[PDB]
Automatic annotation (TrEMBL):
Transmembrane segments: none annotated. This is Uncharacterized protein. Pfam families: ThiS (PF02597). InterPro entries: Beta-grasp_dom_sf (IPR012675), MoaD_arc-typ (IPR010038), Mopterin_synth/thiamin_S_b (IPR016155), SAMP1_3 (IPR054834), Sulfur_Carrier/Prot_Modifier (IPR052045), ThiS/MoaD-like (IPR003749). PANTHER family: SULFUR CARRIER PROTEIN CYSO, SULFUR CARRIER PROTEIN SLR0821-RELATED. It comes from the Archaea.
Length: 90
């Protein structure tokens, strides 16, 4: 299972609604699913051009997936993803 959080920045992008998903144990499907779930606006808002636009900082399982494998990063029911807004705000 995978859990994702959203702040006031992603509020209007996620309809202030958070939920968990089960089935796959990888970020590949997580990002691919969440990307379409909300749309490109979300992926771009939290990643415009393969990089943070404003300053969106999101960690995975308490460790940036970039450390080892991006979307190839494995995740378990225990793993948890948290999204953090930009130091500025939009």
């Amino acid at each position: 299972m995978v859990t994702v959080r959203y702040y006031a920045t992603l509020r209007p992008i996620t309809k202030k609604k958070e939920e968990t998903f089960n089935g796959i144990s990888k970020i590949s499907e997580l990002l691919e699913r969440l990307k379409v779930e909300y749309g490109s606006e979300f992926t771009k808002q939290m990643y415009d051009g393969n990089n943070l636009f404003k300053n969106v900082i999101i960690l995975v399982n308490g460790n940036n997936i970039t450390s080892m494998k991006g979307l190839d990063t494995e995740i378990k029911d225990d793993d948890k993803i948290d999204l953090f807004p930009p130091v500025a705000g939009g």
